[PDB]
Design an enzyme around this catalytic site. Structure first.
Site, PDB file in Angstrom:
ATOM      1  N   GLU A 136       0.746  -1.246   0.000  1.00 57.13           N
ATOM      2  CA  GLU A 136       0.000   0.000   0.000  1.00 57.13           C
ATOM      3  C   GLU A 136       0.782   1.307   0.000  1.00 57.13           C
ATOM      4  O   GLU A 136       0.993   1.905   1.057  1.00 57.13           O
ATOM      5  CB  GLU A 136      -0.896   0.000   1.264  1.00 57.13           C
ATOM      6  N   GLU A 225      -6.212  -7.298  -0.848  1.00 58.07           N
ATOM      7  CA  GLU A 225      -6.478  -7.134   0.573  1.00 58.07           C
ATOM      8  C   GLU A 225      -7.812  -6.392   0.743  1.00 58.07           C
ATOM      9  O   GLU A 225      -8.001  -5.328   0.157  1.00 58.07           O
ATOM     10  CB  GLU A 225      -5.374  -6.293   1.235  1.00 58.07           C
TER      11      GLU A 225
END
Ligand SMILES: OC[C@H]1O[C@@H](O[C@H]2[C@H](O)[C@@H](O)[C@H](O)O[C@@H]2CO)[C@H](O)[C@@H](O)[C@@H]1O
Length: 300
Positions: A136, A225
């Site tokens: 991320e 995710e």
């Protein structure tokens, strides 16, 4: 026999397809950080997930900072145990270079290139492997064009020298939500997918429209995710919105991995405090989140 049946995965017209060209959808679980909850990542628990939950992919979340790989590189061996279990169980496995507080992937890019060179040299001739090179990317100062794309254009060549075409998932801006910018300025590698992550605590109607925009540019998207909680990984369980996202992902043929397989006391955790780290959980040993996720994959 998932991997024996589907074998070599690739991207065809922005969709994940097997070696005979049919669309395939992976659904599985991600570990929590391997420096904290590595005991839940072993052959027996992965086999329980495969047989009782029906998972066909497992994601090993190797944090780089927060006590992860940069501070203590021994965690890379837990990644190797997860990969070997996946190969033994004939399911897919994502190797995730889990950046987060180290918000720009360039911070540890030299270490990432060495890590990915080693993993791709070890496992590059197995079709199970999927490389996730920057979980991320986040922050206003970390953009696709200036930071993420160039990082990927340094790491991908390292992988590709050892493993010419296993799938590579590349994170996007704003905690892997900005698939719009990535889709307008795509990478050249034909077997790349862009990561898109969501949390059911957030009202997601525009986020679904943004995934649709990216798909419409021919970019492939992997939901590497997602959680049933708020964006912090806690704050309640939001199953109505979770189901909307589940249905959206089935309509678009999006593959996904849920966050996460641990007994931590946080809403997104799939297991309750007494869950055995080697599998065999009863209903009482799964949290509200874990029961829902297991039902979604069994229904699949
Ligand atoms: O308990 C381990 C470790 O967790 C950290 O929080 C995690 C959260 O549990 C996870 O769901 C989310 O995705 O990421 C955060 C941040 O890594 C927590 O901040 C640490 O103090 C804690 O030791």
């Amino acid at each position: 026999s998932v991997v024996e049946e589907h074998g070599q995965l690739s991207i065809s017209n922005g969709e994940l397809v097997n070696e005979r060209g049919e669309q395939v959808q992976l659904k599985g679980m991600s570990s929590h950080g391997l420096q904290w909850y590595g005991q839940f990542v072993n052959y027996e628990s992965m086999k329980w997930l495969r047989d009782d939950w029906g998972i066909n992919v497992f994601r090993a979340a190797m944090y780089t900072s927060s006590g992860g790989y940069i501070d203590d590189p021994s965690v890379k061996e837990k990644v190797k145990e997860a990969v070997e279990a996946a190969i033994d169980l004939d399911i897919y496995v994502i190797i995730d270079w889990h950046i987060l507080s180290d918000n720009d992937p360039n911070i540890y890019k030299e270490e990432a290139k060495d890590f990915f060179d080693e993993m791709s040299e070890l496992y590059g001739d197995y079709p199970n492997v999927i490389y996730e090179i920057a979980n991320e990317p986040n922050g206003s100062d970390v953009t696709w064009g200036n930071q993420i794309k160039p990082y990927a254009e340094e790491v991908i060549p390292i992988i590709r020298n050892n493993d010419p075409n296993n799938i590579i998932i590349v994170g996007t801006g704003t905690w892997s939500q900005d698939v719009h910018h990535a889709a307008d300025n795509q990478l050249a590698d034909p077997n790349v997918m862009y990561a898109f992550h969501f949390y059911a605590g957030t009202h997601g109607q525009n986020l679904r429209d943004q995934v649709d925009y990216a798909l419409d540019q021919g970019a492939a998207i992997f939901v590497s995710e997602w959680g049933t909680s708020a964006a912090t990984g806690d704050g309640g369980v939001f199953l109505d919105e979770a189901q909307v996202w589940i249905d959206f992902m089935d309509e678009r043929n999006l593959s996904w991995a849920n966050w996460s397989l641990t007994h931590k006391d946080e809403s997104s955790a799939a297991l309750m405090p007494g869950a055995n780290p080697t599998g065999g959980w009863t209903e009482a040993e799964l949290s509200p989140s874990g029961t829902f996720v297991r039902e979604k994959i069994r229904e699949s």
